[model samples]
Target: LLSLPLVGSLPFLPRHGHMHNNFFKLQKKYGPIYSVRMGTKTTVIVGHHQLAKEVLIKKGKDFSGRPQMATLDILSNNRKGIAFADSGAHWQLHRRLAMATFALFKDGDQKLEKIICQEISTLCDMLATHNGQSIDISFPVFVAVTNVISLICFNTSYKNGDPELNVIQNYNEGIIDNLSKDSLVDLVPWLKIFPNKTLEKLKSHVKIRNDLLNKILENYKEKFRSDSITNMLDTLMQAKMNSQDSELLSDNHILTTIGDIFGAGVETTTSVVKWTLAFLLHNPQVKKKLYEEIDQNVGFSRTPTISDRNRLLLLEATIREVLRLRPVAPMLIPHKANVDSSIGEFAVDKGTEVIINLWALHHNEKEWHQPDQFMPERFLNPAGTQLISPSVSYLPFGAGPRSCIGEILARQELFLIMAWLLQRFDLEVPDDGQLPSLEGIPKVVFLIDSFKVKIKVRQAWREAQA
Candidate 1:
């Protein structure tokens, strides 16, 4: 029995699919702090708000670096990108570039909003073509996100069947699949020496992606314009020139950074949107309530936009609930310790790897009333009023200074796409089969799956007529 408790004590115990389920089970028996031997590394899983705050906030400087993984490091060219880099000048430079680039079109900036609205309109028209038919829905969501990023990076959008877009998506899917598996390379340094097929494929995919990004960068370099506002690549090129330090980044550096933005941004946001739609379909009453709120608040005369997110209580609650139940990065990216520190009475040695089990914390019984159920009503008061608080217990985009830089952009995308979809279509499982099981499973990099769903165009609104 002791062996059962201790042997299975590790976070990735039994199987990776069972890890999320097991973490919740262990949290019930062992409180918040627990040790798990993930391969050769001993990881400390922090499962409560206070402890998370302690590690990521109060002792942030001590826990600022990222854990090193062999395959990822090689693909990212030794942690030069924002997602994998340690706390240093390179990381700071990347972060500054991201903030400036994103800030230009945030807050329903007329230009950005117009681009998004155009894409949403295109998506609605595509769905209308398949009215009363069943579709996966995830692919379309992925397309919308990719087009948006393309607009940001290259000032252009790809049609659904564009070959270049297909190549990018195929390569990205391969990379994500390889990374999701809890490979030995991530845990043991020596295992990295072995020739791994996944690593080889990832390297190939990275090359392809880098080649495409370099083309965009080269185009901007040759046609350098001081006053022209083309796209994000233009901004980065201009910024690169303004800085006195010409050696700050190479052509490869700019390409990889752009690739990181796409890789990190696309998968997470697309997964969240799919999960939200699944939740709404599973709970029809919740979906009706949200639709009613959107119709009453924003109306059908114009599609919902980011500016209307604050006023749509039920829609916002639904988003919060979806994030609570199914965060895109369930464990989030791991953080490594820069110095010895204490996290909620436990000693964290310098170089210790810290895994924030967001899955366990969001579902902890002490923090939430119905920890397992998909209830959006909890975010509302007894009188159905929405409450906005920065509760540590509800961290989807994460917390502290090193939180996700794309939070604002992601929020706008999620709100606009979901609102527009709900306004014009009704989604459901196919009649021939049952809904796909959302039972947690672990892959090479992240814990997510492709969901199967049927979508039907709703003709109740004049927007549908349009």
Candidate 2:
């Protein structure tokens, strides 16, 4: 798999549309550790979970650095943001600040929970207006999720046709589409000198995003009170004000950090929720089991809260299964080796691009009973009383140092929104019996083809509300 000269194995690589599937397919032929070169770049794939655990956990520090890709550099503002920044003091500082901010919101009071619940209620109300009709749940789900993140970032929310919201959505769509398409510009930096439409579009969208984030940051910065730390931005501002490394946490840093949190929080969580709904639409049996648990455990006395999580084991399990089957970031943002290190027996040189095929880890046949099957029961104990991760193979959120900062927050929002929605309505298929397509389009994020689910309001809940 080593094509020499200018191309360097590019001709031998998979021609599939999505890199995750391509990597997953290649893993079968080459076993777990597959190496290939794209132009001048040497990329290594960690397909299996043990290697994933090794690279992302056991030797996480060695593999924590992110590759200096041309496109990502632009996307992350020359590596100012946490997601794509190189693993170093600057990255670590921002990561800790972000994490501490999240922890502050989560641990202090029910403020974060209240924000999420308010959004979830609005989402459920929007779904209720459909009146047992089949509708594309995407827009509503996106709006609500976006609002949750928006409130966190800017202390604002959006109505269905809000211009600010529309601006955010449109630019984000452009950014998501153009940035992750595996363009030649990303592979060969010199190609950027030529006319590249994708790069241009990405740059424009990024500018739009930056402008929006900048405007919001400026508005907050003007009136920001250190005594009143209401949102993530305020918390970050407070932290930045007191930091010894105040120079590193500049306005650009805060803007990019806010963008990272909002972008990652809204897009990934919304995608997972949408995937879960689609899965429920296709698998009625799983839907039935989930409702039974929701009805019995949650009852309609009050809406499901994070405190109810212990009893709503099945809902959590179902989410785990959805995440396993369709991880949004299938090939998590590529990890680069910071120093010369070894992944198991293989010697890794500094600056080597290490990609973890999370899709492969979730579907590892050796680690899972029926890797391809959508059985949430796999996460449950034999008696089905407890939710147990059967193996370490399951890592919906990537592990170790670079793991998702929003995992805890994401989990809380997912559970509350899902539990609340499931308790209020049941997902059904259209009269044509067409279900939401589970076949994800592999890209920057694994996306399910746009599909609608029929919402059936639960009679018991309707009566309870009445």
Candidate 3:
């Protein structure tokens, strides 16, 4: 009876899909740092900002490992990808190489901006074709975001209804559906002997994804030029060509890393953008302020660029507030204790799983005023000229050794996309249609319920366009 304590406690548990919220509820009863036994592993939930910092930043080294799991193994190519890979020298090399490559776009050039704006421009043109018609922005938004990530990964972008894009989208949906669900196989290793349809479907989809990647790689190789790196794959190819170390990054490593970037990039950024649009629709006053800010600073003659980010204070605040309200990964990929360590006063054993409840941190009563409100002013200063986080609780992208590597790109992309969007069109509720549900459907990432908007090209922008 005592062998599986979690099974005994399961009878009194909250709804399964709401695990993050369930964890948040637990934080109210148990203190900030507490542990729950799951089968043979001890999972520690860190809800408070200080404890989250301690686990993710302070004692990062001691708690940077990932617990062994089947789904992650399938997704990460046996832990080769940076997100799921355990903290080690190999991870360090891949992460550093990725950071170095990203820095080229992030710091050195305007190429990244150009690439993003190109897609944003396409999206705006497509939306404008509707000309104030009611339409769901989800699919179009996904395509634009996918193109941006596609260009970053393989120097390829897809048009709407592109066959290859459809394939990628289908496979990604399959993977997300299969992997997000908690499988008994993940918790119980012995169940692998049984025929599991979920695992089979997941493996099949992954194979298709890998085949697509291989095709992309072959195309890249066939068109190979000099050592000049155009995209992420090229950088990895160059690293492999130059490296004398045989055990370093391999072909599988490169593909898996690219897979991680492409998947995470498309999903998270697209969701955030959708949430931002949804929030604007819900809060008309906020949308008005955003319009005024963009008009005053950027004007109708030109679209918003990365440089105008600082000047578009209200837009910046709105994005921040959106992230705070609906964090991409509320529990962040669970961290494993690499070695026995203490989180604040509690002792955590080696191999224990650490779950940082970002939802709780973002909604902490003491830290944020009106914790549930969608007030962008919470992130701005008294004069509303500069962005600020009044408390340490707002970490949309987790911090420290394992913080999101795409933070710089994500931030820049979000700012430009949101600014350009508001600059051209006004988001409105459909004729006699209901407003979007503010409550998000929690999964790996908290996702806003799908909604449609009436896109009316701004009068000033329409005149400018004419």
Candidate 4:
């Protein structure tokens, strides 16, 4: 058993905000791959890009497995959801349903494109009113972001200050903030018997989440018709009835599926856009480059489309740079070893949890030049026209069979929204000349809070509208 040195043995402490900062330091000592005991459970952390591929790709049969922990059972409805469920026919079926649900990625998905553009246009109109005034952009942007999923999930959208969005946001916050994946309750199920403040809140949030989801489902169920397939829900209903075992498509299963997409999709793109705006604010030269691309490729008067998608090279490069720097999840959602296996020469027993430290690889010195720098030019080829494809290690979404299903839809949203934002206004520091903190609050996702940013309508747009 060629086990790597115990990360605990080192005199390193993970910081309060980020659980993996210490893991970064530990990797400097324990090469790319190492094992440590998370309480009584022994786990391995894979940092090397190739080794990650080895575990998650080549050995995906063994490592695509997810931990069937008590916390996750509560968080994801007993792992019936696609995200945290173990790799099997169950996951396969749900994964198919999940992928097929995002009709935004199909050939000529102009409807999805039209929805994002319309949402972004509405957002821009709202932003225009606050011209030269410092405002917290996250909430409005968040409303639009959440609506993207809502439109797909149930053909629903929300207006600003809508109570529906408020309740949704509140429960979403409650679940993400309080439900800890690494909670000791998962390690020791006995603690769940005695409810604490956190668990109580978590249960309430879960109930709130499930109630709304069920309400939406039941409403659709009551009005079910195969001919009126408005969104994913209608299609999924067809799936349930078509199946030989309708039990395969339980309400809990459907609820958790929507939950996974809504949670994963909304929070991630919002974070990336927030961070992208921050970076664009800080780097005028980069913003100028993006402006040039939009000006030439997709004019200010019109919303960009998927057909002209390739022409906005600079915007695409800039988006990839943001993801590389501030990935949605720094670590892949925790995975578990399905059977007794070895990662490289190291031996691992069954029932061990594993994590792929994606942040480490994105910031790896060997894989990148000026790894910490946010230079988007590096992605440009010799002509500085199109982006050179990133190396395999430049993974923002984890790679392999278990890679993110929302990537196509995510990229589509990222392209349209970022382009639309640029087309409409310039994001800047407040009138006081104080910029929002580039060092965003650290947690599972990188989020920019109530920092004031001034949105000035672009001169061309302002003049054109006038």
CA-only RMSD, every prediction: 3.5, 3.0, 3.1, 4.0
Better of 1 and 3 by TM-score: 3
lDDT per residue as tens, model 2, 1-466: 9955652335234444556666677766788887876556788888888888999889999999988766677788889879989998778988887777665556445378988999889889878989779888877878888888787766778877678877877988888887756421233344455676767788999999999778777777788887777677777778777866787789888778777888898888888888988888778888888888888987998888888888889898988999999987887888999999998789999989998888788888888998898999998999988889798888888999999988888998889988998889867887778876688766677777888777888889878976
Q: Which regions of candidate 4 deviate over 4 angstroms?
A: 1-11, 14-17, 103-110, 181-196
lDDT of 2: 0.81
Residues 141-232, candidate 1: write the lDDT tens digits. Answer: 77888888888877777877778867877887777766646522243343455665867777888888878877777776777687875566
- Overall lDDT per candidate, in order of appearance: 0.73, 0.81, 0.81, 0.77
Deviation in angstroms for 11 in model 1? 8.0
Q: What is the TM-score of each candidate against the true structure?
A: 0.90, 0.92, 0.93, 0.91
Model 1: runs farther than 4 Å from truth? 1-16, 28-30, 36-41, 107-110, 182-195, 388-391, 443-448, 462-466
Candidate 4 residue-wise lDDT, 239-340, digit = tens? 888875477678887888888888888888888888888888788899988888788877866678877667888888888999888777778678888789
User: How much is the lDDT of residue 151 in candidate 3?
Assistant: 78
**Candidate 2 minimal-lDDT segment of 10 residues:** 182-191
User: Where's the lowest-lDDT run of ten residues in candidate 1?
Assistant: 182-191
Off by over 4 Å in 2: 1-13, 107-110, 159-161, 182-195
Once model 1 is optimally superposed onto the true structure by TM-score, how far is the C-alpha of residue 100 displaced, in angstroms? 1.1
By lDDT: ranked, best first? 3, 2, 4, 1
